[PDB]
Amino acid sequence: SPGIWQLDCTHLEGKVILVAVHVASGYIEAEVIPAETGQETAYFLLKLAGRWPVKTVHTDNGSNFTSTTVKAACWWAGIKQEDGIPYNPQSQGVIESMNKELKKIIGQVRDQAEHLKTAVQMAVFIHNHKRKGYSAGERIVDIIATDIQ
Amino acid sequence: SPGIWQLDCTHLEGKVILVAVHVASGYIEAEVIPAETGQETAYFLLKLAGRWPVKTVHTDNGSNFTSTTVKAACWWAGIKQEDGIPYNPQSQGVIESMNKELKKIIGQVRDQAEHLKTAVQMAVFIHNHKRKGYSAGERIVDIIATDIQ
Numbered sequence: 001s002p003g004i005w006q007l008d009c010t011h012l013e014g015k016v017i018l019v020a021v022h023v024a025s026g027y028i029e030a031e032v033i034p035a036e037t038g039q040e041t042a043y044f045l046l047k048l049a050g051r052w053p054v055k056t057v058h059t060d061n062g063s064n065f066t067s068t069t070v071k072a073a074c075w076w077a078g079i080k081q082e083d084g085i086p087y088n089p090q091s092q093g094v095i096e097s098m099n100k101e102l103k104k105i106i107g108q109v110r111d112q113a114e115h116l117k118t119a120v121q122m123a124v125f126i127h128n129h130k131r132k133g134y135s136a137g138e139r140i141v142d143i144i145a146t147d148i149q
Numbered sequence: 150s151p152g153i154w155q156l157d158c159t160h161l162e163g164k165v166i167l168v169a170v171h172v173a174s175g176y177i178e179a180e181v182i183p184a185e186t187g188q189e190t191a192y193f194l195l196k197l198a199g200r201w202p203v204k205t206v207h208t209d210n211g212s213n214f215t216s217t218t219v220k221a222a223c224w225w226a227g228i229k230q231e232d233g234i235p236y237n238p239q240s241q242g243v244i245e246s247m248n249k250e251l252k253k254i255i256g257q258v259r260d261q262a263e264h265l266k267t268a269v270q271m272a273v274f275i276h277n278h279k280r281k282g283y284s285a286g287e288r289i290v291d292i293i294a295t296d297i298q
């Protein structure tokens with residue numbers, strides 16, 4: 001449970017935003033890419049797994065699930081790929097709500113950045129620091145420290 | 150102390166690798182860029198601060214310290230910029246040793262990646278997971294959870 005992440009892909013300004021959400025905390029990492037490809041997803045996972053202890057990934061669609069480069073990256077990083085099919089329905093509407101929320105934060109910061117990628121990183125910052133009260137960034141640290149001890 | 154990071158910039162294959170080290174733990178994040186510019190450094194810091202609670206950054210050289218874009222990013226993210234002048238000299242030997250170590254890991258994985266950037270991310274993974282026994286990734290989580298409670 002401390003090691004479960006969900007991939008999510010959303011669109012804005014004719015570009016793609018790739019998001020990884022730490023399920024138990026709501027913490028996210030995100031990037032802007034021109035298109036969702038196996039290779040971009042593979043590279044993103046590799047970055048994620050070097051930064052946080054990623055045990056399981058619920059991939060966002062079947063193409064990435066099937067991608068040989070995504071599989072090679074998951075093999076390399078020790079990640080177990082699963083089919084993020086929502087038996088928990090809330091999780092599906094949780095994503096949709098997250099995408100909406102994230103686009104809301106992006107629009108609020110949009111004017112402070114020339115490039116979408118900067119605005120996305122500002123939005124990641126705001127999301128992870130927003131106190132709900134613990135922040136998502138505080139929750140992920142706590143969940144994983146607990147898991148270690 | 151849980152919030153202190155050090156920037157470091159090293160060279161390989163005619164490219165630049167930008168590294169942020171969490172001083173208390175030895176944990177790192179890293180990226181490949183074509184050249185160290187104010188803007189690249191600013192963007193990197195913005196990414197870092199949305200992911201970990203960055204309070205202080207010891208910048209790697211005076212150009213980045215002076216850069217208006219680096220200052221704007223640090224203002225935005227709430228980061229206090231300092232001049233990473235090694236008042237403790239090592240420190241300075243610690244970085245040099247880290248750069249050497251990191252290039253050693255890169256050469257060991259180099260054949261498993263077409264592009265240098267992938268090899269760098271493999272090396273970050275190996276570095277952060279290497280048990281030394283707690284890993285750097287375990288140490289940073291523990292230091293920050295402690296700080297929260």
Ligand SMILES: CN(Cc1ccc2c(c1C(=O)O)OCO2)C(=O)N[C@@H](C(=O)NC(C)(C)C)c1ccccc1
Pocket residue numbers: 111112113114115116118119188189191192217218221222225
């Ligand atoms: C802290 N930032 C954000 C930032 C940091 C690093 C980056 C960025 C950006 C970005 O604006 O997307 O793009 C790549 O690396 C600024 O100070 N941005 C200024 C600005 O002069 N931006 C540049 C230098 C023309 C790119 C700005 C210009 C226009 C409008 C609003 C702000």
Ligand SMILES: CN(Cc1ccc2c(c1C(=O)O)OCO2)C(=O)N[C@@H](C(=O)NC(C)(C)C)c1ccccc1
Pocket residue numbers: 039040042043068069072073076260261262263264265267268
């Ligand atoms: C898990 N990875 C690493 C990887 C993942 C994602 C990426 C990458 C790379 C990379 O190799 O740098 O480049 C950007 O997005 C592989 O399976 N690499 C293969 C491979 O065929 N890679 C491509 C498809 C030619 C890019 C490989 C090619 C040559 C030598 C060794 C391995």
Ligand SMILES: [Cl-]
Pocket residue numbers: 128129137138198199200201202
């Ligand atoms: Cl944070």
Ligand SMILES: [Cl-]
Pocket residue numbers: 049050051052053277278286287
């Ligand atoms: Cl880790």
